[PDB]
Amino acid sequence: QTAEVTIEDALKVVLRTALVHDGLARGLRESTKALTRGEALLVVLVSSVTEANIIKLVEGLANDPENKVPLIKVADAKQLGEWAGLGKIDREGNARKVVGASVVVVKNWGAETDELSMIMEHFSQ
Amino acid sequence: QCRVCSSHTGLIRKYGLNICRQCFREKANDIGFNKFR
Amino acid sequence: QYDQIINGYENYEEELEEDEEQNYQPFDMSAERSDFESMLDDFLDN
Amino acid sequence: ALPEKVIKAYTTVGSILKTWTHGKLPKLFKVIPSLRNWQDVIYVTNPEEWSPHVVYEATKLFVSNLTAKESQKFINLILLERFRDNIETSEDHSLNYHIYRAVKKSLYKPSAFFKGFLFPLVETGCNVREATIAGSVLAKVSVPALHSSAALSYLLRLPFSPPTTVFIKILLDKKYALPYQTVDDCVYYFMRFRILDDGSNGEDATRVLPVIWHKAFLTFAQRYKNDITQDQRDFLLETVRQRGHKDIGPEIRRELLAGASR
Amino acid sequence: IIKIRITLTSTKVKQLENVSSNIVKNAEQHNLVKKGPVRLPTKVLKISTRKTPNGEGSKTWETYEMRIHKRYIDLEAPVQIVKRITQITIEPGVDVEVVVASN
Ligand SMILES: [Zn+2]
C-alpha cells in the first residue's frame, strides 16, 4: 500500500531502538527463516533492491500474508542497513561505514513495543 | 593437599582433617589438642 | 536503548521477582518436548 | 516432587558428571537446556559436585542453549556459586582454569553475566581476591557497548570499595561509545566524592581514595571530555581541586580543560 | 511419663561436674527417681610425634595427650521438665545428650 515518510522513519527508528534490545534478523535469509518459524513480529523490506527474484518470492507472501505475518516497506537499502547497525553508524561526532541490508525482521520489540503496535496497525489499513 | 597452605606435602589425612603436620601443629591448640606430656 | 536496560540492571532483583512471579511453571513432562522421554528411554538403555 | 525415573536417571548422570573429563557429555545432560523445567532436573545431577570440566562445558551448553533470563538463573545459581566456592575453599585461594574459562563463556551473554554473576557477587561480600579474578575475567572479554554502558552505570551507583573501582576503571578503559546518560552517571559518581561546604556530606567526601579512583577519573576525563556539559566539567574540575592526586590530579584537570561541551 | 537416659562428654572435669551436680540436685529437689551420675573411664587419647622437624640430628620421639571423661544419669519425668532442663543446662566444653528409648 501507499507508504508515507513518517511511517518509514518511525520504522527505521523502530529498527534502531529494537536493535539494542537484541531483537533483529538482518538479511534476506535470516528474515525468511524468521518468518518460517513464526518469529517475525514485523518485517521491513527495502523498496530499492535490484534483483527482484527473492522479492518476487516475498511479494507472493506479501500480497497474500498469513495471520502472523505483518510487513512494511522502507525507501533505501544502505539506510535500512544503517539503522540495523550495519550500513552506517553515524552519531553526533562519530562515523563508521559498512554495507546496507535488503530486509530486516523484528523478533523482540522491547524498547519499541507501542511503536511497532502503531506501525503494524496503521499498515492494517 | 593441606587445606591451609597449598601444600601437597605433610598431609595428616587422618580423621578427615587433612592439615599438613606444620599447619596442624599450629592449629592444634584451636582444634583441641594440647600439650600434656 | 538505555532507559530500558538500566531499569533491568539496577533493579535486577525486582525484575527477577516479577519475571519469576509471571513466568514460573511446575515440572510437567507433557509440556516439555514430547520426544523427551524418548531420550530418557534412549539414554537409560545404553 | 519429581518422578523416581528422573531421580534415579539424573542421580546416575550426577554420578557420571563427577568424574567426566573428555569425550561426549551424557545424553540426559544435553536435553536439559530444552526442558521447560531444567532447574528441578539440573539439581538432581548435583551442581556443586561436578568436575571443573563439566562446569566449563555445562556453562557453554546452557549459556548457548537457554534464554537471557535462563542464562542469568544458571550463571547465578551454579557458576557464581562454584566460582566463589573454588576461590574460598582452595588453599592459595586461586581459581581453576576450567571454571575460569566458564566465566569467560558466561560473559558471551553480558546481560546474563552482569545481572547474574557480577551484580550478585559485588552485593554479597565481594572481597579483593574474587574481584582480582572476576576483574581479570571482565578485563579479558569483549562486551557490547550497550551492556558495558549499563553495567558501568550500575557499578557507579554502587557503594565505594576498591574492587568496584577496579571494575569501573576496567569498563572505562574499554573506551566505547557511552550514551550521554552513562557519562552523566560517571560525572555524578566522580561528583559525589567532593566536599560540600554548605552542610551536606557523606563518607565519600572525606575518605582516602586509591590509585584506581584517580586512574578511572583519568581515563574518564581522557575518553569522555567532549561528552560532558560545561556545568558537569566545572563540578569535575572542582572535584579535581579538592580531591586531586599528586601526579594524576593536574592531568585529569588538564583532560577536562582540553574538552568541548555538548 | 517419660523414662530418659542422659549422657555427658567433656574434657574439662570442672564444667562436667558442675553440670552433673546441677542436674543431680535439680532432679532430686523437685522429686524424681534417678540413678546417680555414673562415671565412665577417662580415655586418654595420645598422639606420638617425632622430635625431628628438620632432618638434623638423630630420631627421638614425643607424645601429645587429651583426657576425655564421660558420665551418665538416668531419670523419669514428663516432657516439660526434660525440655526445660535441657534448655537450662546447655554449657560450653560440656556436651549433653538426651535419649528417650530404653531398648
Ligand atoms: Zn600446611
Curated annotation (Swiss-Prot), chain A:
InterPro entries: Ribosomal_eL30-like_sf, Ribosomal_eL8/eL30/eS12/Gad45, Ribosomal_eS12, Ribosomal_eS12_CS
Assembly, per entry: Component of the small ribosomal subunit (SSU). Mature yeast ribosomes consist of a small (40S) and a large (60S) subunit. The 40S small subunit contains 1 molecule of ribosomal RNA (18S rRNA) and 33 different proteins (encoded by 57 genes). The large 60S subunit contains 3 rRNA molecules (25S, 5.8S and 5S rRNA) and 46 different proteins (encoded by 81 genes).
Protein name: Small ribosomal subunit protein eS12
Record-listed cross-link Glycyl lysine isopeptide (Lys-Gly) (interchain with G-Cter in ubiquitin), residues: K68, K78, K97
GO CC field: cytoplasm; cytosol; cytosolic small ribosomal subunit
An example Gene Ontology molecular-function term: structural constituent of ribosome
Function: Component of the ribosome, a large ribonucleoprotein complex responsible for the synthesis of proteins in the cell. The small ribosomal subunit (SSU) binds messenger RNAs (mRNAs) and translates the encoded message by selecting cognate aminoacyl-transfer RNA (tRNA) molecules. The large subunit (LSU) contains the ribosomal catalytic site termed the peptidyl transferase center (PTC), which catalyzes the formation of peptide bonds, thereby polymerizing the amino acids delivered by tRNAs into a polypeptide chain.
Family: Belongs to the eukaryotic ribosomal protein eS12 family.
Organism this protein belongs to: Saccharomyces cerevisiae (strain ATCC 204508 / S288c)
Matching Gene3D superfamilies: 3.30.1330.30
Chief localisation class: cytoplasm
Record localization: Cytoplasm
UniProtKB/Swiss-Prot annotation, chain B:
Assigned keywords, A-Z: Cytoplasm, Metal-binding, Phosphoprotein, Ribonucleoprotein, Ribosomal protein, Zinc
Necessary cofactors: Zn(2+)
Gene Ontology CC, one term: cytosolic small ribosomal subunit
Note describing how the cofactor binds: Binds 1 zinc ion per subunit.
Residues annotated as transmembrane: none
Superkingdom, taxonomy of origin: Eukaryota
Similarity comment: family membership: Belongs to the universal ribosomal protein uS14 family.
Protein name, UniProt field: Small ribosomal subunit protein uS14A
Species of provenance: Saccharomyces cerevisiae (strain ATCC 204508 / S288c)
From-to range in the entire protein, with total length: 20 to 56 of 56
UniProtKB/Swiss-Prot annotation, chain D:
A GO BP annotation: endonucleolytic cleavage in ITS1 to separate SSU-rRNA from 5.8S rRNA and LSU-rRNA from tricistronic rRNA transcript (SSU-rRNA, 5.8S rRNA, LSU-rRNA)
Keyword annotations from UniProtKB, A to Z: Cytoplasm, Nucleus, Phosphoprotein, Ribosome biogenesis
Top-level division of the source organism's lineage: Eukaryota
Coiled-coil spans in chain: none
Modified residues (Phosphoserine): S200
One GO cellular component term noted in the UniProt record for this chain: cytoplasm
Cellular compartment(s): Cytoplasm; Nucleus, Nucleolus
Single annotated GO MF: snoRNA binding
Note: Present with 21600 molecules/cell in log phase SD medium.
Record family assignment: Belongs to the bystin family.
Role, per record: Required for normal export of the pre-40S particles from the nucleus to the cytoplasm. Its subcellular location and association with pre-40S subunit shifts from mixed cytoplasm/nucleus to all nuclear in RPS19 disruptions, suggesting it acts after the ribosomal protein.
Name by which UniProt lists this protein: Essential nuclear protein 1
Organism: Saccharomyces cerevisiae (strain ATCC 204508 / S288c) (Baker's yeast)
From Swiss-Prot, chain E:
PROSITE patterns on file: RIBOSOMAL_S10
Domain of life, per lineage: Eukaryota
Protein localization: Cytoplasm
Post-translation changes: N-terminally acetylated by acetyltransferase NatA. Also partially acetylated by NatC.
Pfam families (alphabetical): Ribosomal_S10 (PF00338)
Gene Ontology CC terms: cytoplasm; cytosol; cytosolic small ribosomal subunit
One of the protein's GO biological processes: maturation of SSU-rRNA from tricistronic rRNA transcript (SSU-rRNA, 5.8S rRNA, LSU-rRNA)
Record's keyword terms, sorted: Acetylation, Cytoplasm, Isopeptide bond, Ribonucleoprotein, Ribosomal protein, Ubl conjugation
Transmembrane segments: none
Signal peptide: none
Function: Component of the ribosome, a large ribonucleoprotein complex responsible for the synthesis of proteins in the cell. The small ribosomal subunit (SSU) binds messenger RNAs (mRNAs) and translates the encoded message by selecting cognate aminoacyl-transfer RNA (tRNA) molecules. The large subunit (LSU) contains the ribosomal catalytic site termed the peptidyl transferase center (PTC), which catalyzes the formation of peptide bonds, thereby polymerizing the amino acids delivered by tRNAs into a polypeptide chain.
Family in the record: Belongs to the universal ribosomal protein uS10 family.
Protein name (database record): Small ribosomal subunit protein uS10
Protein species of origin: Saccharomyces cerevisiae (strain ATCC 204508 / S288c)
Lineage: Eukaryota, Fungi, Dikarya, Ascomycota, Saccharomycotina
Encoding gene, per UniProt annotation: RPS20
